[PDB]
Design a protein around this ligand. Structure first.
Ligand SMILES: CC1CC(=O)N(c2ccc(F)cc2F)C(=O)C1
Length: 209
């Protein structure tokens, strides 16, 4: 059972700009997704300070980066607070309407795409490198859901029957054919060292057979 939704017009406009603008510095997508994961991990950590049972769904707070060259996917996994179904539908827990407005007002005034995270919509930088993005998520207060979009103005949400995650979010980037450098170990390591050196959670880069 799959529900299909239209993006708000402003969010479709944001995605089109990310997809269509000539902009070579695409590697910042990974910094933005890792930053989102860190923010989600901070949230569950804070809740656990007054209610330890919030971690019954998983005590480890971490970020995993999982390249798969056979599937042409890069997956960013975190054990953060996760997202409810309502969060997913409401622009993956962001204030994306007002964030997009501010971001586009910054671009025509000199800013570049790399500053997207300062406007709270860094998730959408995934479309710098991905033709399709799948988001699997589990929040303590809801069931496990899968969000998906290839842009084009719509996204889907369905209950996820895949492998249970316990708690957190998995962002699966189905990479564009010409963006496979982001599956190479040395390239991922370089980006993490350059942009994510001060993230306060272990970032484990998985290797492939
Ligand atoms: C809490 C997560 C941690 C993790 O990393 N994984 C995972 C492991 C391998 C893989 F390919 C995809 C994953 F989401 C899980 O399933 C549970």
């Amino acid at each position: 059972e799959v529900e299909t939704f239209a993006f708000q017009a402003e969010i479709a406009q944001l995605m089109s700009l990310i997809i269509n603008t000539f902009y070579s510095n695409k590697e910042i997508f990974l910094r933005e997704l890792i930053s989102n994961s860190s923010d989600a991990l901070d949230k569950i950590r804070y809740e656990s300070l007054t209610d330890p049972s919030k971690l019954d769904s998983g005590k480890e707070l971490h970020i995993n980066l999982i390249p798969n060259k056979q599937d042409r996917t890069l997956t960013i996994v975190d054990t953060g607070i996760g997202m409810t179904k309502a969060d997913l539908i409401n622009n993956l827990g962001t204030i994306a309407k007002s964030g997009t407005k501010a971001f586009m007002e910054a671009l025509q005034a000199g800013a570049d795409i790399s500053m997207i995270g300062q406007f709270g919509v860094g998730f959408y930088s995934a479309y710098l490198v991905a033709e399709k993005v799948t988001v699997i998520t589990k929040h303590n207060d809801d069931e496990q859901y899968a969000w998906e979009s290839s842009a084009g103005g719509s996204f889907t949400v369905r209950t996820d029957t895949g492998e249970p995650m316990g708690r957190g979010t998995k962002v699966i980037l189905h990479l564009k054919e010409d963006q496979t450098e982001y599956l190479e170990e040395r390239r991922i390591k370089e980006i993490v060292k350059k942009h994510s050196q001060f993230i306060g959670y272990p970032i484990t880069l998985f290797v492939e057979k």
